[PDB]
Design a protein around this ligand. Structure first.
Ligand SMILES: N=C(N)c1ccc(NC(=O)Nc2ccc(Cl)cc2)cc1
Ligand SMILES: [Ca+2]
Length: 223
């Protein structure tokens, strides 16, 4: 996250870190046994780490559970990043409490102008690299789909939306991939892509989770 603030330990209880020997992507817990993340974060051998704040120090609220199945969206296209979303089932259910909790799926798509909370342990600089150990947060509006499409001509599909600031300065970034965009207490987006980070006229682009709710519910019902 570039230009955000330190969230505070366990203030984002649905935030997950995906670990394969190191943190490589975020995710969101959507019930005690399932995590949603970005399909471009797919790897075999994922361990899901819940209840995290400092990812390099064991602080006492963590649950580390390995994945039993990963399901990338059937129409994920890695060239266009259309349908960048995947479901991860945990080997055993997480114990849910105030510090480890799930986030609700949306019943409606959020509109442009709604302020949302994006969080993750990704890069905090638009030039150079510095990865934080504690979770960073950013409040950002969803942008109109015409300003999103003017920023990225020919690249925005109906399963994507832009959120951020067209003047740059504040944005999600590499390592934030797969993490949550929450608006009005519902999961509305998944950190997906963008050109650089926090650059002028290049806002972050996010998977539009309200288009996938029937696919998620159906897949969790049968797996
Ligand atoms: N500006 C951002 N919000 C931003 C920019 C880039 C990323 N990350 C990626 O674009 N990562 C990535 C995308 C596709 C593939 Cl195939 C591999 C990595 C995340 C957020
Ligand atoms: Ca920790």
């Amino acid at each position: 996250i570039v230009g955000g603030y330190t969230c505070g330990a366990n203030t984002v209880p649905y935030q997950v870190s995906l670990n394969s020997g190191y943190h490589f992507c975020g995710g969101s817990l959507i019930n005690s046994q399932w995590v949603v993340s970005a399909a471009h974060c797919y790897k075999s051998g994922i361990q899901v780490r819940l209840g995290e704040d400092n990812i390099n120090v064991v602080e006492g609220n963590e649950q580390f559970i390995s994945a039993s199945k990963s399901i990338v969206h059937p129409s994920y296209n890695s060239n266009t990043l259309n349908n960048d979303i995947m479901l991860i089932k945990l080997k055993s259910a997480a114990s849910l409490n105030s510090r480890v909790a799930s986030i609700s799926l949306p019943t409606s798509c959020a509109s442009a102008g709604t302020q949302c909370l994006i969080s993750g342990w990704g890069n905090t600089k638009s030039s150079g690299t510095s990865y934080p150990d504690v979770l960073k947060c950013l409040k950002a509006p969803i942008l109109s789909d015409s300003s999103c499409k003017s920023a990225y001509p020919g690249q925005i599909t109906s399963n994507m939306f832009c959120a951020g600031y067209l003047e740059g300065g504040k944005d999600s970034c590499q390592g934030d991939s797969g993490g949550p965009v929450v608006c009005s207490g519902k999961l509305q987006g998944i950190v997906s892509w963008g050109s650089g980070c926090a650059q002028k006229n290049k806002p972050g682009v996010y998977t539009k989770v309200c288009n996938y709710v029937s696919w998620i519910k159906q897949t969790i019902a049968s797996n």
